[PDB]
Design a binder for these strands. Structure first.
Ligand SMILES: [Mg+2]
Ligand SMILES: [Mg+2]
Ligand SMILES: [Mg+2]
Ligand SMILES: [Mg+2]
Ligand SMILES: [Mg+2]
Ligand SMILES: [Zn+2]
Lengths: 129, 37, 144, 151, 63
RNA sequence: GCCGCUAUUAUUGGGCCUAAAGCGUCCGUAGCCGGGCCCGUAAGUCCCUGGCGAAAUCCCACGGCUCAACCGUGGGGCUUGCUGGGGAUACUGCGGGCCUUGGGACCGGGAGAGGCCGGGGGUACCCCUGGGGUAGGGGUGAAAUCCUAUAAUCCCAGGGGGACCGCCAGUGGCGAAGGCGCCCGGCUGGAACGGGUCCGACGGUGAGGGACGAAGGCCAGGGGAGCGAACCGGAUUAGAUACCCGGGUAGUCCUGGCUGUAAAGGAUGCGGGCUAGGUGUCGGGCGAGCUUCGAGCUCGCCCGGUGCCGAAGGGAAGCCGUUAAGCCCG
């Protein structure tokens, strides 16, 4: 059944970007979907996201800007020390600082770059390039 | 039996129904000469 | 569907299935059950020594026409008869009966038969402690 | 939601609108709404039927919106909530009636399958309600004990 | 944005009055039960597969 | 011989319509995967630090044998790691609490060859009886076997029998699949729609395990019209252990059991989300219009089924294409 709203959201973004849609709606919203979108906005992959509120888990309206090739969840949320991001980059991204691996840490949800400059690891949950 | 559609084809083969029937006759003879005679 | 166990805590069942289908791998099976060692008359060796019992000839498959010379050879380590092909042109004449002969593999794909020789797996290499190549090219005459 | 043994993607259902506050057109207060709930349970209606009647007759949408509480919460407060839960009870009544049918009709294997699926649902809910305490841990479905239960 | 975002009811609650007593009463448009007047016992809406058929609403409102 | 080649073992990273490959279908145990919010814990996880994980071996620099290999000095790594503390708390887990979208229950009016049981019928076919009427009928490519002069075929009036339910009947419907078609009544299953109804994550998949499961076959007991394996005859043919013809046993039907196989096929496992639509059709609902005022007709919309087509896309291609063989989550 439903499992990982985050993966579903990312796949939706990916498919909508392939077909040139300007806005997507992510229906089983989460604080994690929101943090991931915060990061994607900050690194300039999407435009503007707003939380719509129903009586249910809430929706996210997400305005895109044509800067995504592949966005996806690393679903075995892989533990990663502060000195293995090289390898996980090589697995998930095409060039050396091209995209963004999103990492959940004890100090929040971050990019692997910020994690590196903080010297903290965590768990990988998504990639975006 | 476990069967194979590949075997059911006929390009260079005899018909599988009849291959099967032959196999079963042999098996019957063997079973027959094994347990009681 | 998406493949079997992909979960973070599913390594057990994952390992299990990979093992299950390695057993469908036939190379792994032969290596691990040691089937070659059980069915090999050379007993896991690259060469072997044998006594020539008889000299024979073998017809090439279908399109080729020739009588490939060979010898039936009794191997000493086990007393087992195998047939070996004598490369060269007058090799079968340089070879005689009751002669000690060394037995290599003929090459061939799966340690097996080679070319238009249907069912011969072995080569003759030495004859009474002398290479058949040299005997054939004339040098190094035979002791006995 | 034929899902669970039929796998049809049925979508029939209710569409509650997002409501942080009750509607202003509503006449009744929480107290008299509770009184109506209790009245109808004494009339012998299940909680589902109570909500249905309060929706259709009295124009009460979402007793939860009004009172802040659920119908079964109100019933257990006034000492009227059912011993075993209603959905389980309903399934058990179905199963008993079907047992009777199937004793007089042994060759109705399709209805026998319906019974099997009904009892599967029973077992699922029993597992969940044992886990949550709404039944004792030692509770277990049995056809004859369930017959005595219904009766 | 339309017709699946925030799935909203098509049904309405609507105020009606009986022809016999004349008491205004709120009801539901898609009832599962025959709705009766709280005072007279008169059927105000008869149930169907969907939108109930309305008796006794000659002065009506809908919310 | 081992590694590589080999993404021919695939965690990275393979495939299962037609090439090897989706259990016949369902149910469910363990296992694995699991909606959203709040609080806590801090087990996994991350950081920092203490103690260990011998030396040799590996990498690097620098030195000594002419350089090198070799050796030494030092730095690092290696050993699957284990452990003592301290800190963080996003994710997972554990505990508690709230929710309602997923699922379950309920209600309502409908639909449907879903199933079981009873009753009532419909032709047709076969036999018997009686009447008529005489010389052939039947069958084939052509013939014959066979039936018939004890009266056949044909026609007519009666009786009996067993099976089976035509046309309507459809890319139709119901069902997990197998499969299910005369009508009427009774018992019963499941689904869709409508639903500001209830419960409140109860869910998915399912090793093992269980249930159902076409025809056929077997045990026992009944029945036996038609058809009819085996068999028996007539032909055909070079032959004809067959195809054609005439008969005919089991069987086909019923009861109760076993068997548990099929091109059991959508040759496509199940669930969930996303990615243009068009046009039909079934069911329910809504809104309009028309009406012979009909459980009626037409148009549109929503949901759910079932089909065709189809851009993008996919694919070895055929073909698939929101009922994916596409992307993602199991
Ligand atoms: Mg292979
Ligand atoms: Mg392959
Ligand atoms: Mg195949
Ligand atoms: Mg060491
Ligand atoms: Mg097409
Ligand atoms: Zn009134």
């Amino acid at each position: 059944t439903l499992l990982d709203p985050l993966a579903n959201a990312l796949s939706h973004i990916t498919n909508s970007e392939r077909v040139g849609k300007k806005e997507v709606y992510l229906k089983p919203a989460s604080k994690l979907m929101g943090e991931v979108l915060r990061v994607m906005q900050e690194n300039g992959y999407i435009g503007e996201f707003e939380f719509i509120d129903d009586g249910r888990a809430g929706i996210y309206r997400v305005q895109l800007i044509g800067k995504i090739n592949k966005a996806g969840a690393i679903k075995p949320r892989f533990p990663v020390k502060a000195r293995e991001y090289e390898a996980w980059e090589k697995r998930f991204l095409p060039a050396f600082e091209f995209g963004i691996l999103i990492v959940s840490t004890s100090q929040g949800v971050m990019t692997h770059k910020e994690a590196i400059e903080k010297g903290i690891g965590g768990r990988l949950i998504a990639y975006v390039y | 039996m476990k069967r194979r559609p590949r075997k059911w084809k006929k390009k260079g083969r005899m018909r599988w129904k009849w291959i099967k029937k032959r196999i079963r006759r042999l098996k019957k003879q063997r079973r027959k000469e094994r347990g009681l005679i | 569907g998406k493949k079997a166990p992909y979960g973070e805590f599913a390594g057990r069942k994952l390992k299990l299935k990979r093992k299950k289908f390695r057993w469908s791998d036939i190379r792994y099976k032969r290596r691990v059950l040691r089937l070659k060692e059980k069915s090999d008359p050379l007993e896991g060796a690259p060469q072997a020594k044998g006594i020539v019992l008889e000299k024979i000839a073998v017809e090439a498959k279908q399109p080729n026409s020739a009588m490939r010379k060979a010898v039936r050879v009794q191997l000493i380590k086990n007393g087992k008869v195998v047939t070996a092909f004598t490369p060269g042109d007058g090799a079968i004449n340089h070879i005689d009966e009751h002669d000690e002969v060394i037995i290599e593999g003929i090459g061939g794909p799966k340690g097996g038969s080679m070319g238009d020789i249907p069912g011969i797996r072995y080569k003759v290499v030495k004859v009474n402690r002398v290479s058949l190549k040299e005997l054939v090219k004339g040098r190094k005459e035979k002791p006995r | 939601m034929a899902r669970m043994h039929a796998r049809k993607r049925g979508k029939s259902g209710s569409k509650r609108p997002p409501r942080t506050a009750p509607p202003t057109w509503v006449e009744y207060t929480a107290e008299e709404v509770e009184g109506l709930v209790v009245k109808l349970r004494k009339e012998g209606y299940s909680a589902a039927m109570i909500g249905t009647i309060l929706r259709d007759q009295y124009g009460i949408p979402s007793v939860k919106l009004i009172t802040g509480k659920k119908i079964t919460k109100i019933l257990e407060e006034n000492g009227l909530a059912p011993q075993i839960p209603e959905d389980l009870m309903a399934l058990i009544r179905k199963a008993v009636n079907l047992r009777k049918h199937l004793e007089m009709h042994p060759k109705d294997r399709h209805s026998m399958r319906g019974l099997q699926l009904t009892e599967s649902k029973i077992r699922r809910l029993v597992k969940y309600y044992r886990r949550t305490g709404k039944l004792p841990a030692k509770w277990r479905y049995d056809p004859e004990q369930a017959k005595l239960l219904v009766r | 944005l339309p017709k699946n975002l925030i799935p909203m009811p098509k049904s309405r609650f609507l105020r009606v009055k009986c022809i016999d007593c004349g008491n205004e009463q709120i009801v539901f448009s898609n009832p599962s039960t025959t709705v009766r007047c709280l005072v007279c016992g008169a059927t105000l809406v008869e149930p169907t597969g969907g939108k109930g058929i309305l008796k006794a609403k000659v002065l009506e409102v809908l919310e």
